[PDB]
């Protein structure tokens, strides 16, 4: 088997996806940029054997469709899997819809016609997504008229899903009822696309709730209504496709192929009023999801930072021979690499990361800067998410909004209310510092 680091080099972290982090890597000869998903074998358990994974990857490489992500290579070592594929700079689909001023059924029809064309192609090759959601709908380029590329097709079949809430944010909305009970087939992707189509034309999920188990309760029952003012401006054929896509029994449910031939897809692609109420609801929804996610990733980063701060200090304590509390530049690289070796790109990137800390910055001061640089992304994303969530720029977030944020994050109502009081003002609203202080107290600080 070939080695990944010998062919590729890490450029920058693009983000966090399902089953692992996505790194922008570049080929050391041709210079081709690629987005590599790094799945840790310790944190992610396999549902299938090695021969089944190698056979699916081999097929996935030969598959090609303009609305499906392209996979180029695959590597494996003692504790990692490297899925190498194409880079898409357009970002998530919903992040683009919140920035534009006008959105209509013609935009939603062109969006879902692409998603269906991608799903139809992957169904013919006997590949299922299972966890289809807006987060997996990336745009190929920064231009407005850009193709939608679906990511993570077939990973759910070979890798076990996470039980951590930071990895399950917003999944309960789009999951099909048959997937929760065990027996399911490719029709679960039509339900998920049906839920996305519902949110594109209204901005509120069909199966909604104040917590994960309340959302799954509505999904399992399978009941939903078009009883909102925003559904009056929408056509009847759009609702007929939704009714067919959200049919409880999968055998009675429409296929991805037959959904393209529907009267709504054929009329709105081949009067069209703007859905203004849906844009504000998608904006309010997207912001709530991203702040709830950033809150959990901030709490997770503080726990791993405190865990790694004491670990790096214990490694440098043993390496200190005389006991002056100082170490050489070459020694700090051996200890910083030892911290990475114990906790699961290469030696050159590890040596560069130590030089980046030493340019700014005693080994106690080195750990303080090095560990703050690891959390720099999670601290800034939390503040940026709080600012975006606070659309009226009042600087505060009300108790009703906190209950919605903590509700999506699965933090119990009685737990965050006890933490809020440990701020005795009783204002019924909190600023960023007060919100940050609550998250710190909710993760043992």
Ligand X SMILES: CC(C)(C)n1nc(Cc2c[nH]c3ccccc23)c2c(N)ncnc21
Residue 326 assigned to a binding site: yes
83 touching ligand X, by CB under 6 A: yes
Residues binding ligand X: number (CB under 6 A): 16
The interface with ligand X within residues 35-64 (CB under 6 A) comprises 35-37
**Is the CB of 151 or the CB of 188 nearer to ligand X?**
151
Stretch binding ligand X (CB under 6 A), from 85-93, 160-168, 301-309, 413-421:
85-93
Alpha-carbon distance values, 415 to 43, 117, 427 (Å): 28, 45, 18
Shortest distance in whole angstroms from residue 255 CB to ligand X? 24
Residue 33 assigned to a binding site: no
128 touching ligand X, by CB under 6 A: no
From the number of C-beta atoms within 10 Å of its C-beta (0-12, 13-18, 19+), residue 397 rates as buried
- Distance (Å, rounded) from C-alpha 231 to C-alpha 138? 27
**Is the CB of 14 or the CB of 358 nearer to ligand X?**
14
The interface with ligand X within residues 152-211 (CB under 6 A) comprises 152
Residue 429 assigned to a binding site: yes
Residue 331 assigned to a binding site: yes
Shortest distance in whole angstroms from residue 37 CB to ligand X? 4
- Distance (Å, rounded) from C-alpha 165 to C-alpha 299? 12
81 touching ligand X, by CB under 6 A: no
Active site residue 6: no
Token pair belonging to 265: 């897809």
14 touching ligand X, by CB under 6 A: yes
Token pair belonging to 59: 């097929």
- Distance (Å, rounded) from C-alpha 164 to C-alpha 438? 20
Q: Which residue is at the shortest CB distance from ligand X?
A: 15
Tell me the three state secondary structure of residue 277. helix
- Distance (Å, rounded) from C-alpha 11 to C-alpha 36? 11
**Is the CB of 36 or the CB of 234 nearer to ligand X?**
36
Stretch binding ligand X (CB under 6 A), from 11-19, 192-200, 269-277, 339-347:
11-19
Token pair belonging to 254: 């429409």
**Is the CB of 36 or the CB of 44 nearer to ligand X?**
36
Angle at alpha carbon of residue 211, lines to 398 and 405, rounded to 5°: 25
**Is the CB of 69 or the CB of 196 nearer to ligand X?**
69
Give strand pairing partners of 429. 398
The interface with ligand X within residues 217-276 (CB under 6 A) comprises none
133 touching ligand X, by CB under 6 A: no
Annotate 115-141 with b (16+ C-beta within 10 A) or e (fewer).
bbbbbbbbbeeebbbbbbbbbbbbbbe
Residue 107 assigned to a binding site: no
- Distance (Å, rounded) from C-alpha 257 to C-alpha 121? 9
* Catalytic annotation, pick one of 49, 64, 131, 359: 131
- Distance (Å, rounded) from C-alpha 359 to C-alpha 201? 51
Shortest distance in whole angstroms from residue 127 CB to ligand X? 12
From the number of C-beta atoms within 10 Å of its C-beta (0-12, 13-18, 19+), residue 285 rates as buried
Stretch binding ligand X (CB under 6 A), from 78-86, 188-196, 399-407, 423-431:
78-86
294 touching ligand X, by CB under 6 A: no
- Chain mean position to CA 340: 24
402 touching ligand X, by CB under 6 A: no
CA nearest 279: which of 191, 179, 201? 201
Shortest distance in whole angstroms from residue 158 CB to ligand X? 11
DSSP state of 161: P
Q: For ligand X, which residue of 4, 8, 17, 389 counts as binding (CB under 6 A)?
A: 17
Q: For ligand X, which residue of 151, 197, 420, 442 counts as binding (CB under 6 A)?
A: 151
**Is the CB of 105 or the CB of 152 nearer to ligand X?**
152
Residue 324 assigned to a binding site: yes
Q: For ligand X, which residue of 44, 87, 241, 370 counts as binding (CB under 6 A)?
A: 87
Residue 338 assigned to a binding site: no
- Distance (Å, rounded) from C-alpha 396 to C-alpha 381? 17
The helix or strand, by DSSP H or E, that contains position 65, with its residue range, turns out to be none
DSSP string, 392-434: T--S-EEHHHHHHHHHHTT--HHHHHHHHH---S--SEE-HHH
The catalytic residues are: 131
Q: Which residues are annotated as a binding site for Ca(2+)?
A: 320, 322, 324, 326, 331, 362, 365, 390, 392, 394, 396, 401, 423, 425, 427, 429, 434
Binding site for ligand X (CB under 6 A): 14-15, 17, 22, 35-37, 69, 83, 85-88, 138, 151-152
């Amino acid at each position: 088997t070939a080695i990944f680091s010998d062919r590729y080099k890490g450029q920058r972290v693009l983000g966090k996806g399902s089953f692992g982090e996505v790194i922008l890597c570049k080929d050391k000869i041709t210079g081709q940029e690629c987005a590599v998903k790094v799945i840790s074998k310790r944190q992610v358990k396999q549902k299938t054997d090695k021969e089944s994974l190698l056979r699916e990857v081999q097929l996935l490489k030969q598959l090609d469709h303009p609305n499906i992500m392209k996979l180029y290579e695959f590597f494996e070592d003692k504790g990692y899997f490297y899925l190498v594929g194409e880079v898409y700079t357009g970002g998530e689909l919903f992040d683009e819809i919140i920035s534009r001023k006008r959105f209509s059924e013609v935009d939603a029809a062109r969006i879902i016609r692409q998603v269906l064309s991608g799903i139809t192609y992957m169904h013919k090759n006997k590949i299922v997504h299972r966890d289809l959601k807006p987060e997996n709908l990336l745009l190929e380029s920064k231009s407005k008229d850009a193709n939608i590329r679906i990511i993570d097709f077939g990973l759910s079949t070979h890798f076990e899903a996470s039980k951590k809430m930071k990895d399950k944010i917003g999944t309960a909305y789009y999951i099909a009822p048959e997937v929760l009970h065990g027996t399911y087939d490719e029709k679960c992707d039509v339900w998920s696309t049906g839920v996305i189509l519902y949110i594109l034309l209204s901005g509120c999920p069909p199966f909604n709730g104040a917590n994960e188990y309340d959302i799954l309760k509505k999904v399992e029952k399978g009941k939903y209504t078009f009883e909102l003012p925003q559904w009056k401006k929408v056509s009847e054929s759009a609702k007929d496709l939704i009714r067919k896509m959200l049919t409880y029994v999968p055998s009675m449910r429409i296929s991805a192929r037959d959904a393209l031939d529907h009267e709504w897809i054929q009329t709105y692609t081949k009067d069209v009023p703007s859905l203004d109420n849906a844009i504000l609801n998608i904006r309010q929804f997207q912001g709530t999801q991203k702040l709830a996610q950033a809150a959990l990733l901030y709490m997770g980063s503080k726990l791993t930072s405190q865990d790694e701060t004491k670990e790096l200090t214990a490694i440098f304590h043993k390496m200190d021979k005389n006991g002056d509390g100082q170490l050489d530049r070459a020694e700090l690289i051996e200890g910083y690499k030892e911290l990475m070796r114990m906790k699961g790109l290469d030696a050159s990137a590890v040596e560069h990361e130590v030089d980046q800390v030493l340019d700014a910055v005693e080994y106690s001061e080195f750990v303080t800067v090095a560990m703050d640089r690891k959390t720099l992304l999670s601290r800034e994303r939390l503040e940026r998410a709080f600012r975006m969530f606070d659309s009226d720029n009042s600087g505060k977030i009300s108790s009703t909004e906190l209950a919605t944020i903590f509700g999506v994050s699965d933090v119990d109502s009685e737990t965050w209310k006890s933490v809020l009081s440990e701020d005795k003002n009783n204002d019924g609203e909190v600023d960023f510092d007060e919100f940050q202080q609550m998250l710190l107290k909710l993760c043992g600080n």
